[PDB]
Amino acid sequence: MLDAFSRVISNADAKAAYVGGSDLQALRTFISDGNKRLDAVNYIVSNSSCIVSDAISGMICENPGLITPGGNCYTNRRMAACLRDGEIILRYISYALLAGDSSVLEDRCLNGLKETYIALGVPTNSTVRAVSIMKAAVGAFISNTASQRKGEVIEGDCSALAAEIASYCDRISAAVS
């Protein structure tokens, strides 16, 4: 897998070019703002139980047919598997946020998810909803604007990270779509 820094090396290798200023600049800000990044990632792992349960629950309250005889969330065994899938997805999202790359979420998560869901009969359209709500909660816990969770981290700008985590959530939705 790659992260922010080795992704640059990969693109520079393709040109057989050392890494200099231009590319060094962006990686220097990564370091610079690196403590906000560690915080953002913690906001996810800190409320990951609530983010998945609230999202899996939301996807059902909007679609009761999911917990109905014929629905993919019917029986404890399907509900627990869906909650588990929601937990694994958000973990690979959190990985990608820590490394500053999606190489790990798409290599180890999204690689063969859709096709797997097609086979299992898992509703991909609904999954994209759980993923969408998780995006909102995550977005909220990162900016510290969580309706219920309120911590005291030193104030600053975390829009680039939020726009960054959102993008990872989007590659999931786009991947199983």
Partner: peptide, 6 residues
């Protein structure tokens, strides 16, 4: 193992 095949 259904993740592998599919």
């Amino acid at each position: 193992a259904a993740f592998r095949a599919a």
